[PDB]
Scaffold this active site. Structure first.
Site, PDB file in Angstrom:
ATOM      1  N   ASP A  10       2.785  -0.955   3.811  1.00  0.00           N
ATOM      2  CA  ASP A  10       4.027  -1.516   3.289  1.00  0.00           C
ATOM      3  C   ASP A  10       5.178  -0.526   3.189  1.00  0.00           C
ATOM      4  O   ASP A  10       6.221  -0.858   2.637  1.00  0.00           O
ATOM      5  CB  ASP A  10       3.785  -2.154   1.910  1.00  0.00           C
ATOM      6  CG  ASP A  10       3.225  -1.162   0.890  1.00  0.00           C
ATOM      7  OD1 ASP A  10       3.296   0.059   1.145  1.00  0.00           O
ATOM      8  OD2 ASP A  10       2.724  -1.605  -0.166  1.00  0.00           O
ATOM      9  N   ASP A 120      -8.133  -0.714   0.289  1.00  0.00           N
ATOM     10  CA  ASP A 120      -7.144  -1.328   1.179  1.00  0.00           C
ATOM     11  C   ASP A 120      -6.716  -0.178   2.095  1.00  0.00           C
ATOM     12  O   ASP A 120      -5.905   0.674   1.709  1.00  0.00           O
ATOM     13  CB  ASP A 120      -5.955  -1.865   0.367  1.00  0.00           C
ATOM     14  CG  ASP A 120      -5.049  -2.788   1.179  1.00  0.00           C
ATOM     15  OD1 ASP A 120      -4.174  -3.447   0.573  1.00  0.00           O
ATOM     16  OD2 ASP A 120      -5.200  -2.859   2.416  1.00  0.00           O
TER      17      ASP A 120
HETATM   18  O1  LIG Z   1       7.957   4.319 -10.798  1.00  0.00           O
HETATM   19  C1  LIG Z   1       7.378   3.174 -11.411  1.00  0.00           C
HETATM   20  C2  LIG Z   1       5.855   3.321 -11.391  1.00  0.00           C
HETATM   21  O2  LIG Z   1       5.486   3.505 -10.015  1.00  0.00           O
HETATM   22  C3  LIG Z   1       4.066   3.602  -9.690  1.00  0.00           C
HETATM   23  O3  LIG Z   1       3.950   3.860  -8.297  1.00  0.00           O
HETATM   24  C4  LIG Z   1       4.313   2.763  -7.457  1.00  0.00           C
HETATM   25  C5  LIG Z   1       4.899   3.285  -6.157  1.00  0.00           C
HETATM   26  O4  LIG Z   1       6.043   4.063  -6.515  1.00  0.00           O
HETATM   27  C6  LIG Z   1       5.331   2.114  -5.275  1.00  0.00           C
HETATM   28  O5  LIG Z   1       5.873   2.647  -4.064  1.00  0.00           O
HETATM   29  C7  LIG Z   1       4.126   1.203  -4.973  1.00  0.00           C
HETATM   30  O6  LIG Z   1       4.493   0.182  -4.058  1.00  0.00           O
HETATM   31  O7  LIG Z   1       3.631   0.682  -6.280  1.00  0.00           O
HETATM   32  C8  LIG Z   1       3.190   1.701  -7.221  1.00  0.00           C
HETATM   33  C9  LIG Z   1       2.682   0.965  -8.489  1.00  0.00           C
HETATM   34  O8  LIG Z   1       3.727   0.230  -9.115  1.00  0.00           O
HETATM   35  C10 LIG Z   1       3.476   4.767 -10.495  1.00  0.00           C
HETATM   36  O9  LIG Z   1       2.088   4.839 -10.205  1.00  0.00           O
HETATM   37  C11 LIG Z   1       3.792   4.642 -11.986  1.00  0.00           C
HETATM   38  O10 LIG Z   1       3.285   5.802 -12.648  1.00  0.00           O
HETATM   39  C12 LIG Z   1       5.332   4.572 -12.153  1.00  0.00           C
HETATM   40  O11 LIG Z   1       5.718   4.541 -13.523  1.00  0.00           O
END
Ligand SMILES: OC[C@H]1O[C@@H](O[C@H]2[C@H](O)[C@@H](O)[C@H](O)O[C@@H]2CO)[C@H](O)[C@@H](O)[C@@H]1O
Length: 207
Positions: A10, A120
Protein backbone atom coordinates in the site's frame (compact mmCIF):
# COMPACT_ATOMS: atom_id res chain seq x y z
CA UNK A 1 3.81 -22.42 15.23
CA UNK A 2 1.09 -22.25 12.57
CA UNK A 3 -0.05 -19.19 10.63
CA UNK A 4 -1.70 -17.95 7.47
CA UNK A 5 -0.82 -15.35 4.88
CA UNK A 6 -2.11 -12.65 2.59
CA UNK A 7 -0.21 -10.29 0.30
CA UNK A 8 -0.15 -6.52 -0.10
CA UNK A 9 1.66 -3.29 -0.94
CA UNK A 10 0.00 0.00 0.00
CA UNK A 11 3.05 2.30 -0.17
CA UNK A 12 2.41 3.35 3.46
CA UNK A 13 5.19 4.13 5.94
CA UNK A 14 5.81 0.91 7.87
CA UNK A 15 4.59 0.85 11.49
CA UNK A 16 8.01 -0.40 12.63
CA UNK A 17 9.33 2.66 10.82
CA UNK A 18 8.64 4.73 13.94
CA UNK A 19 11.00 4.86 16.93
CA UNK A 20 9.84 3.28 20.18
CA UNK A 21 8.29 0.19 18.61
CA UNK A 22 10.82 -2.16 20.16
CA UNK A 23 14.43 -2.57 21.38
CA UNK A 24 16.22 -1.87 18.11
CA UNK A 25 19.35 -0.09 16.93
CA UNK A 26 17.18 2.07 14.62
CA UNK A 27 13.66 1.63 13.20
CA UNK A 28 12.85 0.45 9.65
CA UNK A 29 13.88 2.98 6.97
CA UNK A 30 11.14 4.96 5.21
CA UNK A 31 11.44 6.29 1.67
CA UNK A 32 10.32 9.42 -0.13
CA UNK A 33 8.04 9.44 -3.17
CA UNK A 34 11.07 8.59 -5.32
CA UNK A 35 11.95 5.43 -3.38
CA UNK A 36 14.99 7.04 -1.73
CA UNK A 37 15.76 6.56 1.96
CA UNK A 38 14.57 9.21 4.41
CA UNK A 39 16.66 10.39 7.37
CA UNK A 40 13.76 11.39 9.62
CA UNK A 41 12.01 8.39 11.21
CA UNK A 42 9.39 10.73 12.70
CA UNK A 43 8.17 11.83 9.27
CA UNK A 44 4.45 11.74 8.51
CA UNK A 45 3.29 8.68 6.56
CA UNK A 46 2.34 8.92 2.89
CA UNK A 47 -0.92 7.36 4.01
CA UNK A 48 -1.46 10.22 6.44
CA UNK A 49 -0.97 12.89 3.74
CA UNK A 50 2.76 13.00 4.41
CA UNK A 51 6.07 12.24 2.61
CA UNK A 52 7.07 8.93 4.20
CA UNK A 53 6.32 5.96 1.93
CA UNK A 54 7.40 2.33 1.80
CA UNK A 55 10.86 1.63 0.35
CA UNK A 56 10.77 -0.42 -2.87
CA UNK A 57 13.80 -2.41 -1.73
CA UNK A 58 11.68 -3.90 1.05
CA UNK A 59 10.56 -6.43 -1.55
CA UNK A 60 10.76 -10.24 -1.53
CA UNK A 61 13.42 -12.03 -3.61
CA UNK A 62 14.66 -15.55 -4.27
CA UNK A 63 17.86 -16.80 -2.66
CA UNK A 64 17.66 -20.19 -4.38
CA UNK A 65 14.93 -22.49 -5.72
CA UNK A 66 13.87 -23.38 -2.15
CA UNK A 67 14.36 -20.12 -0.28
CA UNK A 68 13.41 -16.43 -0.49
CA UNK A 69 13.90 -13.46 1.81
CA UNK A 70 11.13 -10.93 2.33
CA UNK A 71 9.08 -8.61 4.52
CA UNK A 72 5.58 -8.61 5.96
CA UNK A 73 3.02 -6.81 8.09
CA UNK A 74 2.52 -9.17 11.00
CA UNK A 75 0.06 -9.85 13.80
CA UNK A 76 0.73 -12.64 16.30
CA UNK A 77 -1.91 -14.11 18.61
CA UNK A 78 -1.84 -12.39 21.99
CA UNK A 79 1.32 -10.40 21.22
CA UNK A 80 2.16 -6.73 20.57
CA UNK A 81 4.40 -4.85 18.09
CA UNK A 82 7.16 -4.64 20.68
CA UNK A 83 7.65 -8.39 20.30
CA UNK A 84 7.65 -8.60 16.50
CA UNK A 85 8.97 -5.31 15.09
CA UNK A 86 12.07 -6.09 13.02
CA UNK A 87 12.03 -9.70 14.19
CA UNK A 88 12.57 -12.37 11.51
CA UNK A 89 10.64 -15.59 11.06
CA UNK A 90 11.37 -18.65 8.93
CA UNK A 91 8.17 -19.68 7.16
CA UNK A 92 7.69 -23.09 5.59
CA UNK A 93 4.66 -23.14 3.32
CA UNK A 94 2.22 -25.97 3.92
CA UNK A 95 -0.26 -25.27 1.12
CA UNK A 96 -0.42 -23.76 -2.35
CA UNK A 97 1.93 -24.41 -5.29
CA UNK A 98 4.96 -23.54 -3.13
CA UNK A 99 4.34 -26.07 -0.36
CA UNK A 100 7.73 -27.08 0.99
CA UNK A 101 9.46 -23.82 0.09
CA UNK A 102 10.87 -21.61 2.82
CA UNK A 103 10.98 -17.86 3.18
CA UNK A 104 12.65 -15.81 5.90
CA UNK A 105 10.77 -12.56 6.43
CA UNK A 106 11.37 -9.56 8.66
CA UNK A 107 8.36 -7.92 10.32
CA UNK A 108 8.33 -4.27 9.31
CA UNK A 109 4.71 -3.39 9.97
CA UNK A 110 1.59 -4.56 11.77
CA UNK A 111 -1.56 -6.14 10.39
CA UNK A 112 -5.07 -5.57 11.74
CA UNK A 113 -5.98 -9.17 12.54
CA UNK A 114 -6.50 -10.19 16.16
CA UNK A 115 -6.41 -13.62 17.76
CA UNK A 116 -4.33 -15.12 14.95
CA UNK A 117 -0.83 -15.58 13.53
CA UNK A 118 -1.11 -13.63 10.29
CA UNK A 119 1.65 -12.58 7.89
CA UNK A 120 0.59 -10.11 5.17
CA UNK A 121 3.56 -10.42 2.80
CA UNK A 122 5.02 -7.31 1.18
CA UNK A 123 4.43 -7.86 -2.55
CA UNK A 124 4.31 -4.97 -5.03
CA UNK A 125 0.98 -5.29 -6.81
CA UNK A 126 -0.29 -7.81 -4.30
CA UNK A 127 -3.05 -5.39 -3.43
CA UNK A 128 -3.24 -1.96 -1.86
CA UNK A 129 -5.77 -3.18 0.74
CA UNK A 130 -7.27 -1.13 3.57
CA UNK A 131 -5.07 1.92 2.88
CA UNK A 132 -3.82 3.36 -0.40
CA UNK A 133 -0.63 5.42 -0.21
CA UNK A 134 0.35 4.44 -3.74
CA UNK A 135 -2.13 6.83 -5.35
CA UNK A 136 -0.60 9.82 -3.49
CA UNK A 137 2.96 8.53 -4.03
CA UNK A 138 2.89 8.14 -7.80
CA UNK A 139 -0.63 7.90 -9.18
CA UNK A 140 -1.44 4.44 -7.84
CA UNK A 141 -0.95 0.80 -8.79
CA UNK A 142 -3.25 -1.25 -11.03
CA UNK A 143 -5.19 -4.27 -9.81
CA UNK A 144 -8.06 -5.10 -7.48
CA UNK A 145 -8.01 -3.43 -4.04
CA UNK A 146 -7.19 -6.72 -2.31
CA UNK A 147 -5.11 -9.31 -4.17
CA UNK A 148 -3.93 -6.68 -6.63
CA UNK A 149 -3.00 -7.61 -10.19
CA UNK A 150 -3.66 -11.03 -11.72
CA UNK A 151 -0.97 -11.32 -14.45
CA UNK A 152 2.83 -10.97 -14.46
CA UNK A 153 2.61 -8.82 -17.56
CA UNK A 154 0.76 -6.20 -15.47
CA UNK A 155 4.03 -5.54 -13.61
CA UNK A 156 5.26 -3.83 -16.79
CA UNK A 157 3.57 -0.50 -15.98
CA UNK A 158 4.96 -0.40 -12.43
CA UNK A 159 7.57 2.12 -11.32
CA UNK A 160 10.92 0.47 -12.03
CA UNK A 161 11.96 -0.10 -8.38
CA UNK A 162 8.77 -2.10 -7.68
CA UNK A 163 8.98 -4.39 -10.74
CA UNK A 164 11.21 -7.17 -9.40
CA UNK A 165 9.09 -7.66 -6.27
CA UNK A 166 6.00 -7.64 -8.46
CA UNK A 167 7.47 -10.30 -10.76
CA UNK A 168 8.85 -12.43 -7.91
CA UNK A 169 5.21 -13.22 -7.18
CA UNK A 170 4.67 -15.05 -10.48
CA UNK A 171 8.09 -16.71 -10.49
CA UNK A 172 9.49 -18.20 -7.26
CA UNK A 173 6.09 -17.72 -5.61
CA UNK A 174 4.14 -19.26 -8.52
CA UNK A 175 1.29 -16.80 -7.82
CA UNK A 176 0.38 -18.73 -4.66
CA UNK A 177 -2.86 -17.39 -3.14
CA UNK A 178 -2.64 -17.02 0.63
CA UNK A 179 -0.52 -20.10 1.38
CA UNK A 180 -0.49 -21.34 5.00
CA UNK A 181 2.78 -22.11 6.81
CA UNK A 182 4.57 -23.22 9.98
CA UNK A 183 7.05 -20.72 11.42
CA UNK A 184 9.65 -20.05 14.09
CA UNK A 185 11.50 -16.87 14.89
CA UNK A 186 15.14 -16.96 13.76
CA UNK A 187 18.05 -14.53 13.87
CA UNK A 188 17.62 -12.04 11.04
CA UNK A 189 19.87 -12.70 8.08
CA UNK A 190 22.26 -9.86 7.33
CA UNK A 191 20.67 -9.25 3.92
CA UNK A 192 17.31 -8.30 5.45
CA UNK A 193 18.79 -5.95 8.05
CA UNK A 194 20.83 -4.36 5.23
CA UNK A 195 17.55 -3.43 3.52
CA UNK A 196 15.59 -2.12 6.52
CA UNK A 197 18.45 -1.09 8.80
CA UNK A 198 16.50 -2.45 11.76
CA UNK A 199 17.92 -5.11 14.10
CA UNK A 200 16.44 -6.22 17.46
CA UNK A 201 18.60 -6.35 20.61
CA UNK A 202 17.34 -9.85 21.36
CA UNK A 203 18.16 -11.07 17.84
CA UNK A 204 21.51 -12.63 18.68
CA UNK A 205 19.78 -14.93 21.13
CA UNK A 206 18.25 -16.71 18.17
CA UNK A 207 20.14 -18.74 15.57
O1 LIG B 1 1.44 8.22 13.36
C1 LIG B 1 0.22 7.64 13.82
C2 LIG B 1 0.50 6.20 14.27
O2 LIG B 1 1.08 5.53 13.14
C3 LIG B 1 1.39 4.11 13.26
O3 LIG B 1 2.02 3.69 12.06
C4 LIG B 1 1.17 3.65 10.92
C5 LIG B 1 1.97 3.97 9.67
O4 LIG B 1 2.52 5.27 9.86
C6 LIG B 1 1.05 3.97 8.45
O5 LIG B 1 1.84 4.27 7.29
C7 LIG B 1 0.36 2.60 8.29
O6 LIG B 1 -0.40 2.56 7.10
O7 LIG B 1 -0.45 2.37 9.52
C8 LIG B 1 0.31 2.35 10.77
C9 LIG B 1 -0.69 2.07 11.91
O8 LIG B 1 -1.66 3.11 12.02
C10 LIG B 1 2.34 3.93 14.45
O9 LIG B 1 2.61 2.54 14.59
C11 LIG B 1 1.79 4.59 15.72
O10 LIG B 1 2.76 4.45 16.75
C12 LIG B 1 1.54 6.09 15.42
O11 LIG B 1 1.11 6.80 16.58
Amino acid sequence: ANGQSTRYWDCCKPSCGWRGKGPVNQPVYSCDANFQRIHDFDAVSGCEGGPAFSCADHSPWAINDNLSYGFAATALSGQTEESWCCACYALTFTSGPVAGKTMVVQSTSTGGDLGSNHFDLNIPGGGVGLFDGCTPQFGGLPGARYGGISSRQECDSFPEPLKPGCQWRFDWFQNADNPSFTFERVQCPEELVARTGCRRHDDGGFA
